[PDB]
Every structure is written in C-alpha cells, then in structure tokens.
Amino acid sequence: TSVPTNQSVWGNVSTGLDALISGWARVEQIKAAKASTGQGRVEQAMTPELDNGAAVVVEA
Amino acid sequence: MNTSVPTSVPTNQSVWGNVSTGLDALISGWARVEQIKAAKASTGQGRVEQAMTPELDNGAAVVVE
Amino acid sequence: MANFLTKNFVWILAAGVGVWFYQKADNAAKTATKPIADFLAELQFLVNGSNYVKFPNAGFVLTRDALQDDFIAYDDRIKAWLGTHDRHKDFLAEILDHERRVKPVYRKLIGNIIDASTIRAASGVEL
Fold it and tell me: Cβ of A52 and B58 within 8 Å?
C-alpha cells in the first residue's frame, strides 16, 4: 500500500497537469505535421470504424 | 518581441505497395493454390484442420498485479 | 633492484596517506553509494507527482540543513508519513543554545578582585 501525507507548494502555480497539457500540445503538432503532407492524409485513409475491437489492459 | 517555434518535416513514411506480377503467372499461381486446397481435400487430416478456424468480431483481455 | 624497491616503499606509503585524507573528505559527508533500484525509482516518480521545484535542489538543501541521519531515514520512506517516524520528521528543525560560562565567571573575578572595592567613574573633565 502507498499514500501521501503533508506537502508544500507555490501558490496559484501550474502543476504536473500542465506538464501533461504540453504533451497534448505536442500531439497536436504531430497531427499538424501529418496534415501538411498528402502522405499523412493517405495514412489516415486506412481507418475503419466498427462496433468491435481488441482491448488490452494490465499492470506491469 | 516573440520567438517562433519550429515547423518541420517529421517521421512520415509512405510505403507504396508496388505489386507487379504477370497475369498469366498469377493465373497459374491461383491454379497452384487450388491444387494445394485439393491436397487438403483428399485427406481427412486436411478437413479437421479447417474445423478449428471460425471468425469473430474482436477480442478482449484484462488483468492486474 | 635496490633503488626500485626503495622508491616503491616511499611512493606507496605516500599514496596511502593521500588515500586516507581523500577517504576522510568523502567520509565527512554520508556515503552516497546506493545499492538498490526500488526506492530510487519510486521517489523520482513521487517527485514529478508532487510538482516541487527541483527535487535535486530541495534534497541537497534539506539533507545538509536537517542532518544526514534525519535525511537518510526520511529519504528511505519515499512517500507517506505515519506513526512516530512521521511525527518526528514533520516537527523537525535545527538547534541553538545559551548558558552561563566564561563571561559570567570572568565578571565574578572582577567583582572579587574589587573587594572591598575602589571607586572608578567618568563624566567630568574639561568638556
């Protein structure tokens, strides 16, 4: 078992969540890179949407 | 004033499957696969192999440690 | 043969003295050699989770200020805080002191030397 107790931090400041937000900003730039090239558009053309799919989830 | 961020070309690999094969050479190839199916048809062991292969919509799995 | 043996004994003894002084310099602070991958990985993950400014900078400042014994014990417990270990670490700090000794004893000797005493003063003069 694990838990945290008692901490200190700067006021009204960006936390680790904004470190993730940059990752979402980075993935947008990755999509924009595919958007600039026609080869990126053709890669997205092989995408079917159906009701079923393979799922996997486990700790390691 | 402002400092501009970089716009560049990243890892994008377009793999065009350039398939070039002689129509008559294919007709034989399609004919050869018919002979392979006929070899399985002659034996009962060939029939039993195909009985173990159905089709499903998808899969799933879950666990924890 | 003789010169090589004589030089080897003197030089090796000199190297041993440098090793002893170098050992004392490194041994002055606590031995930084860590043999494990459990606490190092978890504490680093907890450091990024808490979002504290510079975990390495905060650790260096806290380790020297709060002492090595208190730092090493608290650092072992990567996260959480329960029991007497938590209470002691939560309300921990440095220390100062004040007491009578050389100053008061020297002043008493001046009073003893001035017995039954003689009058000394200032305030008068040509001003």
Answer: yes
Method by which the model was determined: X-ray
C95 token code pair: 């220390």
Give the span between the Cα atoms of B13 and A46, in whole angstroms.
Answer: 14
- Binding-site residues on chain A for chain C (CB distance < 8 A): 2-10, 15-16, 19
Do C and A count as touching (3 or more CB pairs closer than 8 A)? yes
Distance (Å, whole) CA C75 – CA A35: 48
DSSP labels, chain A? ----------TT---HHHHHHHHHHHHHHHHHHHHHSHHHHHHHTT----S-----B---
Cβ distance C46 to A7 less than 8 Å, yes or no, reads no
Task: Give the experimental resolution in Å.
Answer: 7.0
Between residues 5 and 44 of chain C, which touch chain A (CB distance below 8 Å)?
none
